[PDB]
């Protein structure tokens, strides 16, 4: 749908009607759940914009441990780093649900800027937003304890994916227990320990691949 796409960084509230003959300049791509869109260290000159579904963005250490940098969703762009800075992928992108996306290569993207510097503005916004988040995560890593980081990641997930459910916030993250801990960037044992405490205190309820946050207030205080 073009409604999702017009919320995408690149073309975000620009053309009233002729936003369309450019979306058609991209053929769509459907991926099953658990599909490796691209792997660490592969060449690439393709960026993707998600129409629906989620994609986890990951790094793997020498000894097989995994970290998740971010979870991408509808309207989010990924694989953009090798577009602007040619070279191999430094991250893996893996589908966590069935995903509909749309795809574009560097030369095509370069073509859609030579008319339109406002698009470049929007892409620089996205990169700077991501730079800020990584810097905010770096600060959390050194100076916030694991439960505070669990609390922060749950609230960050809620900011992107949450929906109100009465006096509570439903956050359908589509992540496994292990993937939540990889996203936090801390041990499964200590992340599960924090989640249990927060559930016991009645701040959250863990339900499949969704969490219900009943007390965003006390959760936020803990993330401080």
The whole-angstrom separation of Cα 193 and Cα 183 is 15
Q: Which is nearer to Cl ion, 22 or 81 (CB)?
A: 81
Among 44, 58, 147, 162, binds Cl ion (CB under 5 A): 44
Of residues 78 and 198, the one with the C-beta less far from Cl ion: 78
d(CA 222, CA 224): 5
Segment contacting its own copies (CB under 8 A): 92-100, 122-130, 157-165, 194-202? Answer: 122-130
The listed partner (Cl ion, its own copies, none) that binds 163, CB under 5 to 8 Å by sort, is none
Q: Exposed e or buried b for every residue in 28-37, given b needs 16+ CB within 10 A?
A: eeebeeeeeb
> What is the pattern of x (binds its own copies, CB under 8 A) and - over residues 73-112?
-------xx-xxx----xx------------------x--
| Closest listed residue to residue 50, CA positions, set 84, 79, 85, 25 | 79
Verify binding: residue 79, Cl ion, rule CB under 5 A: yes
10/219 with CB nearer Cl ion: 10
Residue 224: which of its own copies, Cl ion, none does it interact with, CB under 5 to 8 A by kind? its own copies
Distance in angstroms (rounded) separating the CA atoms of residues 81 and 45: 9
Which partner, its own copies, Cl ion, none, binds residue 44 by CB below 5 to 8 Å per kind? Cl ion
Is 81 a residue that touches Cl ion (CB under 5 A)? yes
Cβ 216 vs Cβ 169: under 8 Å: yes
DSSP secondary structure code for residue 136 in this structure: H
67 lies in the binding site for its own copies (CB under 8 A):
yes
E strand map for the chain: 28-31, 36-38, 46-52, 55-60, 66-72, 77-78, 92-95, 99-105, 162-165, 168-172, 204-207, 210-213
Q: Report if residue 139 touches its own copies, rule: CB under 8 A.
A: yes
The one of Cl ion, its own copies, none whose footprint includes residue 1, by CB under 5 to 8 A per kind, is none
Cβ atoms 143, 223 nearer than 8 A: no
**Sites of contact with its own copies (CB under 8 A):** 59, 61-62, 65, 67, 69, 80-81, 83-85, 90-91, 110, 113-114, 117, 120-121, 123-125, 127-132, 134-139, 141-143, 149-150, 153, 185-187, 190, 224
């Amino acid at each position: 749908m073009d409604e999702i796409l017009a919320r995408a960084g690149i073309f975000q509230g620009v053309e009233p009607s002729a936003i369309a003959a450019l979306t058609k300049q991209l053929q769509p791509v459907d991926f099953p759940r658990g599909h490796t869109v691209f792997a660490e260290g592969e060449p690439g000159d393709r960026l993707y914009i998600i129409i629906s579904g989620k994609v986890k963005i990951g790094r793997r250490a020498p000894d097989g441990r995994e970290n998740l940098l971010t979870i991408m969703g509808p309207s989010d762009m990924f694989g953009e780093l090798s577009i602007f800075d040619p070279g191999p992928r430094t991250s893996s992108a893996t589908t966590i649900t069935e995903v509909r996306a749309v795809s574009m290569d560097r030369d095509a993207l370069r073509s859609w800027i030579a008319d339109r510097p406002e698009i470049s503005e929007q892409l620089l916004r996205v990169l700077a937003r991501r730079l800020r988040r990584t810097n905010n995560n770096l600060a959390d890593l050194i100076f916030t304890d694991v439960p505070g980081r669990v609390a922060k990641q749950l609230l960050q997930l809620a900011q992107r994916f949450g929906t109100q459910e009465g006096g509570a916030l439903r956050v359908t993250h589509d992540l496994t227990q292990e993937e939540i801990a990889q996203l936090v960037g801390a041990s499964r044992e200590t992340v599960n320990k924090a989640l249990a405490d927060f559930a016991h205190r009645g701040w959250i309820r863990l339900e499949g691949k969704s969490v219900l946050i009943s007390d965003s207030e006390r959760l936020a205080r803990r993330a401080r």
